[PDB]
Amino acid sequence: SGNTGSIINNYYMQQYQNSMDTQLGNDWFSKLASSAFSGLFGALL
Amino acid sequence: SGNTGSIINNYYMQQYQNSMDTQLGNDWFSKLASSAFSGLFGALL
Amino acid sequence: SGNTGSIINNYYMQQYQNSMDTQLGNDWFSKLASSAFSGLFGALL
Amino acid sequence: TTSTGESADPVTTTVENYGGETQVQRRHHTDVSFILDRFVKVTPKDSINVLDLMQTPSHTLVGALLRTATYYFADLEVAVKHKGDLTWVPNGAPVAALDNTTNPTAYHKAPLTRLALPYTAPHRVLATVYNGRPLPTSFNYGAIKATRVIELLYRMKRAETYCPRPLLAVHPSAARHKQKIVAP
Amino acid sequence: GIFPVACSDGYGGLVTTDPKTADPVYGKVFNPPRNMLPGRFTNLLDVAEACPTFLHFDGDVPYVTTKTDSDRVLAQFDLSLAAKHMSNTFLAGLAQYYTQYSGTVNLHFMFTGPTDAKARYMIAYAPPGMEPPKTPEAAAHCIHAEWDTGLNSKFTFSIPYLSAADYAYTASDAAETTNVQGWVCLFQITHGKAEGDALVVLASAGKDFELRLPVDARQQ
Amino acid sequence: GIFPVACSDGYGGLVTTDPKTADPVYGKVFNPPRNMLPGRFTNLLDVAEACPTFLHFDGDVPYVTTKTDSDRVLAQFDLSLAAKHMSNTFLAGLAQYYTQYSGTVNLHFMFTGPTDAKARYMIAYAPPGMEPPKTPEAAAHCIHAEWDTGLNSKFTFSIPYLSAADYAYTASDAAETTNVQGWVCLFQITHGKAEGDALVVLASAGKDFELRLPVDARQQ
Amino acid sequence: GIFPVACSDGYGGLVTTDPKTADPVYGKVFNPPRNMLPGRFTNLLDVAEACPTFLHFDGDVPYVTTKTDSDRVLAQFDLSLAAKHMSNTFLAGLAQYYTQYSGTVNLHFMFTGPTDAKARYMIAYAPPGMEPPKTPEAAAHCIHAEWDTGLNSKFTFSIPYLSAADYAYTASDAAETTNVQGWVCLFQITHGKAEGDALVVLASAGKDFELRLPVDARQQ
């Protein structure tokens, strides 16, 4: 969550601290790393 | 509620912060915007 | 616990205050002092 | 671990192929919203200058882990050594606006003046490169003016990026890029 | 020992838009009652929607007269809240203190001819990229809509909001001569004994107009 | 009396990496939606593992050609994230902003010869203390592993992490010419009608690569 | 209004031994594991009790030889942790950084003669006020205790702590030549064919040694 290291809630409200997000209606490259094939591809001896 | 963005109650009392209101016994232009006719006025085809 | 003498938890989080320790899988010289033989070694009169 | 190479499918074989045993690998210092929050310093201009996240140099730590992501969104922070009455217009204000006091204006108070201003732009997410090098006018955060701006710093908050881009290390003439390291 | 604090550096300056409030000096004041004073408005866009205002066509009048010659275009103007045809109207007077906008802008067309004069009009919306249309036959591929004069005088057509970027500016820099938003053209198809009549126009905020990023910048 | 505090001495300076956050001035901003934009990556090592990149062998090409002469060594290089053979690759470009590392580094070897050309290769890892091997018969006592070309082209061998100290540097000071980490040698055992072919190589992060102590130090 | 505080006067200076802690700048560091490293000691007196160290008798040797002449005193010295006979030992090296002490100090006497040599010794403790004894017959009214050499070599006698004031200094000012703590005398009663033998001595902390008021004052 970045360089934020206080255990007290900031004095100012959330909407005044930063831009409030809006919705309509790492995400992908972390799905790629888990898909990585790692097992042996041939018959081990 | 204007540029007031603290989550802590102000140190001073309410009556010392600002003039206390008195009662006897947007309000209207917002009633006007809802009265606005928007439907079709004729027979649609 | 060293020269730390406040009764309030420090404002910053634990991980930002100092390096978090890691585990794998006075300790010894205090075991030595308790092992110290002190009784009489001969027959008292 | 032979597998079809012309497939762009990631294949990460591990040390357990010949008896090894992978220790635990924890990565906190390499996150994308933890490494960008560090006050990179930009070459400050004269009286009036614009808050564009691309005038930061391309060889810093924030300027170079930013030109590795095609798109990015991040709130901002500054800390300037204004010699005057610095003001700040939002994105898209007529450049004659930063002469009026109704706009957010900080008064002089030694030594710095640290502000935390939001992200205001029409586009849902900015971009480092643009296939129209000059980017459009719409890509910025605002413009500050003072009598004489002395210092300026950028610290992105809540940063989140998409669509990575190449990073380049320095090319050494020798076989290995040797240099000094601190030593007692 | 006293509670020790660390006076932070680069804080506390008098920012002109800080959320803090000052400390009082007088206190204990009861003001006269204001229960239900007539005509209070809370938001500045509420008055913009409920009350339309005139445009500024050629000359000083807010109306366009009917063209009896070979021409068919009455008047076409840019779709910008800084345009000349919208110089002095509430919606364009309020939208100079804000930077960006996104929404619909209704247009109210009101015919003020005699009882024995008839006419038919068209209004079309041309987006950026192509030069605006010049004939009604070449403008019928837009989002046009036609109306006919009769018992009911006024007809209101609300031009849509189409834009790549989510929000659009309320200004026009000199570097951009392309008029990034587009045009809005108004044509007169035909008319019957309608010499020298008048079609006064108006303009009002839409049902979902949004205005944001306030900047008071050099008007008064 | 007011709550008395003691302004501490030697505190509050603007440290470039403080966890504090500044106080706002504008507030009340709703930005456009970004629900599910394609291709977001959260960590910088996630992209390093899922996407390999080429090395920089002699000349400018990233491939090594097959040696038909008495020699058997293709190319051997230091095991350092600052080495020349890894000059311009993502894993060595990212690891210049961090001081120390600890983990495995996969190597992907891909053979691009004709259908009627065959070859056999070996890659071995020589630790510090002894000069690197120069013949395959003298390198078979390392952690080597051999592969053969055929239907499946690519073979990926992940060199291990062996070090006395728990973490290792991502730099090479001039005082240390010993190459404290070691070498990684790549030999070609034999080949059949494989004149002038190519074996392009790649390099990717391991399954447990760890990178830490960030320092942005004079690259851009 | 903001919470009003009163910046107190005469507070906040950087005292070299304040209990406060500084504010961080870097954060998020995981150091290598140290589970059960061998030989950790927590307190500095624990090592003083479990490990004795030699004294410094005449010359440089730590042992006293057996006196065959009419004399009977081997060596008597002050009871002070600054005395010369305790110049270079752990217990007197550690007790120069502290001002006061209170407890017992064990003495370990170890006889290193041949198999056919026998001896008998006495150690007595003389408090302040009277000059120290000079003959064993005149020292038998102290807290003495005698031992005899044989199968078991070492004998350990722990001189007590007697003092009017509750704690005693670990220094000796020039103004006080009286040696406020006292003496500790060591006599040799008799010996049989014990010419030129050796009785090495040691010194260790007691079971209830207490050391306090730390002051680092001009040794290194």
- Interchain contact, B6 vs A15, CB within 8 Å: no
- Interchain contact, A6 vs C11, CB within 8 Å: yes
Tokens of E96: 């100079």
G118: number of Cβ within 10 Å: 16
Residues in chain A followed by a break, C to N above 2.5 angstroms: 25
Which residue in this structure is represented by tokens 């902003």?
A: F97
Tokens of G123: 């150690």
SS3 F105: strand
Give the residue from G15, G26, G37, G47 with the most C CB atoms within 10 Å of its CB, the best one to mutate.
Answer: G47
d(CA G51, CA C36): 10
SS3 F185: strand
> Is omega for the bond preceding D111 within 30 degrees of 0, making it cis?
yes
Side chain identity, residue G206: G
Tokens of E126: 């041309």
Closest CA to F48 of F77, F86, F99: F86
DSSP-assigned letter for residue F137: G
> Which residues, in sequence order, are bridge partners of residue G111?
G199
Closest CA to E163 of E125, E120, E213, E116: E125
Do D96 and E217 contact (CB within 8 A), yes or no? Answer: yes
User: Chains G vs B: touching, with 3+ CB pairs under 8 Å?
Assistant: yes
Which residue in this structure is represented by tokens 């033998």?
A: G197
Burial class of residue F131 (count of CB atoms within 10 Å of its CB; 0-12, 13-18, 19+)? exposed
Closest CA to E48 of E216, E220, E203: E203
Q: Which residue in C has a C-alpha nearest to residue A9's C-alpha?
A: C11
The CA-based angle F174-F177-F182, given to 5 degrees, is: 130
Do E51 and E90 contact (CB within 8 A), yes or no? Answer: yes
d(CA D78, CA D97): 20
SS3 F93: helix
d(CA F55, CA F203): 7
d(CA E119, CA E67): 11
Cβ-Cβ contacts under 8 Å, A8 against chain C: 11
Query: Dmax of chain D from CA atoms?
Result: 72
DSSP-assigned letter for residue G178: S
Touching D: which chains, 3+ CB pairs < 8 A?
Answer: A, E, F, G
d(CA D102, CA E218): 11
d(CA B17, CA G212): 56
Mapped to the 3 state alphabet, what secondary structure does chain D carry? CCECCCCCCCECCCHHHHCCCCCCCCCCCCECCCCCCCCEECCCCCCEEECCCCCCCCCCCCCCCCCCEEEEEEECCEECCECCCCEEECCCCCCCCCCCCCCCECCCCCCCCEEECCCCCCCCCEECCCCCCCCCCCCCCCEEECCCECCCEECCEEEEEEEECCCCCCCCCCCECCECCCCC
Closest CA to F76 of F111, F121, F110, F112: F121
d(CA F187, CA F192): 15
Question: Residues of F numbered 55-94 whose beta carbons fall under 8 angstroms of chain C's beta carbons: which are they?
Answer: none
Chain A CB within 8 Å of residue B8 CB: yes
SS3 F189: strand
Tokens of G15: 């005292």
Q: β-strand F3-7 against G5-7: which pairing, if any? A: parallel
- Interchain contact, A32 vs F42, CB within 8 Å: no
B6: number of Cβ within 10 Å: 14
Which residue in this structure is represented by tokens 């040691």?
A: G202
Which residue in this structure is represented by tokens 């006495």?
A: G122
Tokens of G21: 């802690």
Which residue in this structure is represented by tokens 């209830």?
A: G208
Which residue in this structure is represented by tokens 């994105």?
A: D91
d(CA D42, CA D69): 19
Which residue in this structure is represented by tokens 């210049």?
A: F96
φ, ψ for residue E145 (rounded to 5)?
Answer: -165, 135
Q: Which residues of E111-124 are buried (b: 16+ CB within 10 A; e: fewer)?
A: bebeeebbbebbbb
The CA-based angle G21-G23-G25, given to 5 degrees, is: 140
d(CA C2, CA F114): 72
Q: Which residue in G has a C-alpha nearest to residue D28's C-alpha?
A: G28
User: Chains G vs E: touching, with 3+ CB pairs under 8 Å?
Assistant: yes
Closest CA to G197 of G63, G94, G105: G63
> Which residues, in sequence order, are bridge partners of residue A16?
none
Do F125 and F175 contact (CB within 8 A), yes or no? Answer: no
Helix (H) or strand (E) holding C31: helix C29-34
Burial class of residue A5 (count of CB atoms within 10 Å of its CB; 0-12, 13-18, 19+)? buried
Tokens of G204: 């260790």
Do F12 and G16 contact (CB within 8 A), yes or no? Answer: no
Tokens of F6: 């003691």
**N- to C-terminal Cα distance for chain F?**
55
Q: Is F193 left (phi over 0), alpha (psi -120 to 50) or beta?
A: left
Q: Is D35 left (phi over 0), alpha (psi -120 to 50) or beta?
A: alpha
Cβ neighbours of residue E181 under 8 Å, at least 6 residues apart? E78, E79, E80, E128, E163, E168
Q: How many residues are present in chain G?
A: 220
Q: What is the DSSP string of G62-126?
A: SEEPPP-SS--B---EESSTT-STTSSSHHHHHTTSEEEEES-EEEEEEE---TT-EEEEEEEEE
d(CA D85, CA D99): 10
- Interchain contact, D90 vs E99, CB within 8 Å: yes
Rg of chain E over all Cα atoms, to the nearest angstrom: 24
Burial class of residue F50 (count of CB atoms within 10 Å of its CB; 0-12, 13-18, 19+)? buried
φ, ψ for residue E148 (rounded to 5)?
Answer: -130, 140
SS3 A16: helix
Do G2 and B11 contact (CB within 8 A), yes or no? Answer: yes
Do D43 and D149 contact (CB within 8 A), yes or no? Answer: no
Query: Dmax of chain B from CA atoms?
Result: 65
Q: To the nearest whole angstrom, how far is the Cα of G29 from the nearest Cα of chain D? A: 8
Cβ neighbours of residue D17 under 8 Å, at least 6 residues apart? A40, D1, F145, F158
Size of interface A-D (CB pairs under 8 A): 47
φ, ψ for residue E73 (rounded to 5)?
Answer: -90, 130
Cβ neighbours of residue C5 under 8 Å, at least 6 residues apart? G19
Do E38 and B28 contact (CB within 8 A), yes or no? Answer: yes
Burial class of residue D36 (count of CB atoms within 10 Å of its CB; 0-12, 13-18, 19+)? buried
d(CA G7, CA G23): 21
Domain positions in chain D? 1-184
Tokens of D103: 């706009």
**N- to C-terminal Cα distance for chain B?**
47
Do G87 and G117 contact (CB within 8 A), yes or no? Answer: no
**At CB < 8 Å, which residues of chain E contact D?**
9-17, 99-100, 165-169, 171, 173, 175-176, 213, 215-218
Instruction: D21-26: list long-range contacts, CB under 8 Å, 24+ apart.
Output: D22/F104, D22/F207, D22/F208, D23/F208, D24/F208, D25/F102, D25/F103, D25/F206, D25/F207, D25/F208, D25/F209, D25/F210, D26/F210, D26/G30
Side chain identity, residue E123: I
Q: To the nearest whole angstrom, how far is the Cα of A22 from the nearest Cα of chain B? A: 20
G44: number of Cβ within 10 Å: 15
Closest CA to F106 of F160, F152, F58, F47: F160
Tokens of A35: 């898909």
d(CA G103, CA G212): 12
d(CA F13, CA F201): 50
Do F126 and F184 contact (CB within 8 A), yes or no? Answer: yes
- Interchain contact, D96 vs E168, CB within 8 Å: no
- Interchain contact, F25 vs E15, CB within 8 Å: yes
Q: How many residues are present in chain F?
A: 220
Give Cα D141 distance to the centre of its chain: 13
Q: Which residue in E has a C-alpha nearest to residue F23's C-alpha?
A: E11
Mapped to the 3 state alphabet, what secondary structure does chain E carry? CCEEECCCCCCCCCCCCCCCCCCCCCCCCECCCCCCCCCCCCCHHHHHHHCCEECCCCCCCCEECCCCCCCCECCCEECCCCCCCCCCCHHHHHCCCEEEEECCEEEEEEECCCCCCEEEEEEEEECCCCCCCCCHHHCCCCCCEEEECCCCCEEEEEECCCCCCCCEECCCCCCCCCCCCCEEEEEEEEEECCCCCCEEEEEEECCCCEEEEECCCCCC
Rg of chain G over all Cα atoms, to the nearest angstrom: 24
CA-to-CA separations, F18 to D153, D170, G24, in angstroms, rounded? 14, 30, 7
CA-to-CA separations, B4 to A15, E133, E142, E213, F21, in angstroms, rounded? 11, 50, 47, 18, 19
Q: β-strand F3-7 against E3-5: which pairing, if any? A: parallel
d(CA A15, CA F41): 26
**N- to C-terminal Cα distance for chain E?**
55
Closest CA to F99 of F79, F78, F81: F81
Give the residue from A7, A9, A10 with the most C CB atoms within 10 Å of its CB, the best one to mutate.
Answer: A7
Size of interface D-G (CB pairs under 8 A): 5
d(CA C9, CA C17): 11
Residue D23 CB-half CA count within 13 A: 18
d(CA D93, CA B16): 39
G17: number of Cβ within 10 Å: 6
d(CA E177, CA G84): 98
Tokens of D30: 């390499």
- Interchain contact, E99 vs D92, CB within 8 Å: yes
Helix (H) or strand (E) holding G167: none
d(CA F112, CA G57): 84
DSSP-assigned letter for residue G190: E
Do D35 and F44 contact (CB within 8 A), yes or no? Answer: yes
- Interchain contact, C23 vs G33, CB within 8 Å: yes
Q: To the nearest whole angstrom, how far is the Cα of F134 from the nearest Cα of chain C? A: 39
d(CA A29, CA F43): 8
Q: To the nearest whole angstrom, how far is the Cα of F12 from the nearest Cα of chain A? A: 15
Resolution of this deposited model, Å:
3.2
SS3 F91: helix
SS3 G28: coil
SS3 B29: helix
Q: To the nearest whole angstrom, how far is the Cα of E172 from the nearest Cα of chain A? A: 26
